[PDB]
């Protein structure tokens, strides 16, 4: 597995941040090395989603950030990233056995030449 | 591996009972000295059990004449005539290395 120029806690923070962003926005632009780590971490969260159990919900809730995605309106209740992972995202991969992400190569970034990719669901 | 499992499967001892670390076992070890073959019992608490398949080993610890002695066997050795589980042990971990660092009265394993 990749050390991403970070300590163990920083890296675990970075993978939690990127994972949540990928679940919330369904498409993010990041570096190639970051995108090749995320695909593992996000496809495991989507698997827990599809599981759907309380146990599975609590495994995902131990990793996914507590970000409000949107506020829907029923008395307007906010929807958290974790609810969007079990209510919206996972069930749309119910008959797909793995491979919920795809990395498109975009090109190098002006400031540091970093190879940039779009990583997206489906 | 799968081929190494197929090759070693014949060497696996089916008689081997179900023990966990914490169980008091009595190992009936064959002692091959020249041509004569003698049986020597070794009764102690199973301290650890590691490895997969034909490579599985376990370690029995007894206090013999006031000195701790550990005895590691392969689980499937044919030099173990018989393995008797004397008492099941209520322990909370897989390796009882802590049984090395304290003497009597604080090493008596809880019996179920």
């Amino acid at each position: 597995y990749r050390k991403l120029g970070r300590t163990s806690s920083q890296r675990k923070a970075l993978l939690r941040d990127l994972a949540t962003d990928l679940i919330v926005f369904e498409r993010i632009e990041t570096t190639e090395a970051r995108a090749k780590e995320i695909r593992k971490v996000v496809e495991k969260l989507i698997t827990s989603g599809k599981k759907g159990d309380l146990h599975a919900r609590r495994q995902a809730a131990a990793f996914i950030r507590h970000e409000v995605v949107e506020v829907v309106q029923v008395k307007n209740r906010p929807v958290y990233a974790l609810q969007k992972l079990f209510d919206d995202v996972a069930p749309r991969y119910a008959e797909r056995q793995g491979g919920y992400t795809r990395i498109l190569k975009k090109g190098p970034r002006r400031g540091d030449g970093a190879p940039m990719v779009i990583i997206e669901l489906v | 591996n799968k081929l190494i499992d197929e090759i070693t499967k014949s060497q696996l001892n089916p008689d081997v009972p179900n023990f966990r670390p914490g169980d008091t076992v009595r190992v009936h070890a064959k002692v091959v000295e020249g041509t004569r073959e003698r049986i020597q019992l070794f009764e102690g608490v199973v301290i650890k059990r590691r490895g997969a398949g034909i490579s599985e080993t376990f370690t029995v610890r007894k206090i013999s004449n006031s000195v701790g002695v550990e005895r590691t066997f392969p689980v499937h050795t044919p030099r173990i005539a018989k393995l008797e589980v004397i008492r099941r042990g209520k322990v909370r971990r897989a390796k009882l290395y802590y049984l090395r660092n304290l003497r009597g009265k604080a090493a008596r394993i809880k019996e179920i």
Partner: protein, 53 residues
């Protein structure tokens, strides 16, 4: 620690024989009709070759 002699022009030029860039690995598209890096999305079409994104 330090250069004993200045490096000559010829010698400096020989050392730089290898300090150079390689041509980019790129080909023309079908849709765009323009150049692109293989295995990248073509931004002229705004997609991955002919496959729409």
């Amino acid at each position: 620690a330090v250069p004993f002699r200045r490096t000559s022009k010829a010698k400096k030029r020989k050392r730089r024989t290898h300090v150079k860039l390689q041509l980019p690995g790129m080909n023309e598209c079908s849709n765009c009709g323009e150049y692109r890096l293989s295995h990248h999305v073509c931004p002229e079409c705004g997609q991955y070759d002919g496959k729409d994104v």
